[PDB]
């Protein structure tokens, strides 16, 4: 089919040149003896032209193209912004005996009956995770391969991470599929979004702090205000800890508080504001504000409570 | 040197707090090592003593630490624990099984649970004895197996209640409560309803219904 050929060509064109061999080796759809026939010294365009011919000579379905897409995706995994789900269960419910095949079948069937045409793939990852790629369609349209959805589900745990691309239309359906396939009664969306899936994972599983205590110069210059400097240093160290901070890039606050400062004393309505913080490495810029003299010694708790509360978007009322 | 005394006091306090927290009071410990190398192989021989509430123990073992380039694997090759000769034979046979299995952590866990249930049994017997001196005959002792309930005026009618602690093959501990009836025949031909032959099952249902001490209290009140 020409569609699968175009899909494979586009996916390969996305791949960087230096790491193309590792992706091809992991995919291993093409025979190993075929690989050395192609030469990677020449132009990228020539290499993709040859690879299309080799993969077309053999039978190539859409499933292996989807598998190549999953393999390419889990290498980069910072091209999308991720969101977190949390599932809950009843008090008297017993611990389940997870079975991969049953999970795959249930997640298949729910989508297959609710919609009509839909493609879902699986790639059982090491370290107890599952990668899923879903192409959305309905009774009267073929699946759209340009806009897939990726979800990472950690078995035996209540958490699943999903990519926000086109999931807005079919969010309740995917929620039902996830909560049925894994035998959970309810599901809610955690208000914590980021582009670093590993930082999200470390925060959500709260394993960013791994230190456990076990037993097994030019004297002419005089620095006044020295006690204040040492006190602010101590307060900053206590508040921000001593571990390496997880890497975020954004934080948002919504304010609905009254103005209290002669000026707007008679006003009885809140002052409506929305503010955002953006940085290449947030929580590291914030740590350095007080020693530099731009903030007071203890920062407000709204800023020092990101990883502990697993919160990224806030709302404040009077 | 005063600060050094301060560290000594702090360490003594920490040791006491930890020992009372876990429930294991550890005595002196000696380690003797021999290096037997071919990838490096090192062997160690250990010796330590201690006690846990009533029970006391002293044990000697040795571990072989097979150091290599990518793993540090240590296996307890030889274990040996010796007990003070009490009459608690079930603890001794559990000692034998654990020695065969060569596991140290499981031994400590099972010993804790065993002595813990033993303390419950002893305290319950003592409390219920001091509650009713007139209807309890503690024939063998509070720290012993069985119990005797009888009337002072007449010794003909008496029921015996047995409390036993059992250690399973896997290692976990669980008790069991049964009873026996020392009843003369004259009472048997006396009453026709005769439900005392069903006493085991009914008693177990009663004790599971609302607790152990409650069932014993109800029975002793009924007997009186």
């Amino acid at each position: 089919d020409e569609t699968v050929a175009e899909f494979i060509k586009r996916t390969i064109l996305k791949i960087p040149m230096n790491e193309l061999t590792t992706i091809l080796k992991a995919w291993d759809f093409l025979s190993e003896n075929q690989l050395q026939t192609v030469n990677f010294r020449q132009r990228k365009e020539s290499v993709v032209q040859h690879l299309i011919h080799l993969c077309e000579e053999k039978r190539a379905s859409i499933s292996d193209a989807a598998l190549l897409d999953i393999i390419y995706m889990q290498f980069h995994q910072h091209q999308k912004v991720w969101e977190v789900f949390q599932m809950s269960k009843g008090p008297g419910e017993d611990v389940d005996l997870f079975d991969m095949k049953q999970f795959k079948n249930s997640f298949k069937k729910i989508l297959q009956r609710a919609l009509k045409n839909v493609t879902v793939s699986f790639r059982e990852t090491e370290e107890n995770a599952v990668w899923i790629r879903i192409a959305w369609g309905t009774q009267y349209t073929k699946p759209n391969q340009y806009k897939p959805t990726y979800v990472v589900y950690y078995s035996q745990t209540p958490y699943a991470f999903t990519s926000s691309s086109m999931l807005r239309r079919n969010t309740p359906l995917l929620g039902q599929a996830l909560t049925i396939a894994s035998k959970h009664h309810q599901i809610v969306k955690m208000d914590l979004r980021s582009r670093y899936l590993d930082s999200l994972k470390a925060i959500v599983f709260k394993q960013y702090n791994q230190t456990f205590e076990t037993h097994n110069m030019d004297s002419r210059i005089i620095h006044e205000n020295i006690v204040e400097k040492e006190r602010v240093q101590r307060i900053t160290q206590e508040t921000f800890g001593d571990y390496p901070q997880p890497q975020l890039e954004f934080a948002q606050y919504k304010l609905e508080t009254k103005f209290k400062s002669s000026i707007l004393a008679e006003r009885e309505e809140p002052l409506r504001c929305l503010i955002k913080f953006s940085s290449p490495h947030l929580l590291e810029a914030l740590k350095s504000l007080a020693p530099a003299g731009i903030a007071d010694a203890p920062l407000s708790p709204l800023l020092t409570c990101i990883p502990n509360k697993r919160m990224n978007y806030f709302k404040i009322r009077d | 040197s005063k600060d050094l005394k301060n560290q000594l006091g702090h360490l003594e306090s920490e040791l006491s707090f930890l020992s009372t927290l876990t429930g294991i009071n550890i005595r002196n410990h000696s380690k003797q090592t021999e290096d037997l190398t071919s990838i490096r192989k090192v062997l160690q021989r250990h010796r330590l003593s201690g006690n846990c509430h009533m029970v006391t123990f002293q044990l000697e073992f040795q571990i072989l630490e097979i150091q290599n380039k990518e793993r540090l694997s240590s296996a307890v090759t030889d274990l040996n624990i010796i007990m003070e000769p009490t009459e608690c034979s079930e603890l001794s046979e559990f000692v034998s099984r654990a020695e065969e299995r060569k596991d140290l952590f499981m031994f400590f866990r099972s010993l804790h649970f065993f002595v813990e249930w033993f303390e419950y049994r002893k305290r319950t017997f003592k409390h219920l004895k001091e509650k009713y001196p007139d209807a309890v005959y503690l024939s063998e002792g509070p720290s012993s197996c069985s119990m005797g309930i009888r009337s002072a005026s007449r010794p003909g009618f008496e029921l015996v209640i047995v409390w036993r602690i059992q250690i399973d093959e896997d290692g976990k501990v669980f008790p069991k409560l049964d009873l026996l009836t020392k009843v003369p025949q004259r009472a048997l031909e006396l009453d026709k309803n005769r439900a005392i032959e069903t006493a085991p099952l009914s008693f177990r249902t009663l004790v599971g219904l609302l607790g152990i001490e409650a069932a014993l209290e109800s029975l002793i009140k009924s007997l009186c």
Partner: protein, 52 residues
């Protein structure tokens, strides 16, 4: 339009199941509690009468 109805009725059933599951269990120990209580009362009365 029908797809949404399917989704919401599925939510309905998924929420309803735990309640029945809990209620059946509760009745199950309640009845046994009553029966065992009556048996214990009968046995204690009989033994007290026999000893008296």
């Amino acid at each position: 339009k029908k797809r949404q109805r399917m989704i919401e009725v599925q939510d309905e059933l998924l929420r309803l199941e735990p309640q029945l599951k809990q209620l059946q269990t509760k009745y199950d120990e309640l009845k046994e509690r009553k029966s065992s209580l009556r048996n214990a009362a009968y046995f204690l009365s009989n033994l007290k009468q026999l000893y008296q």
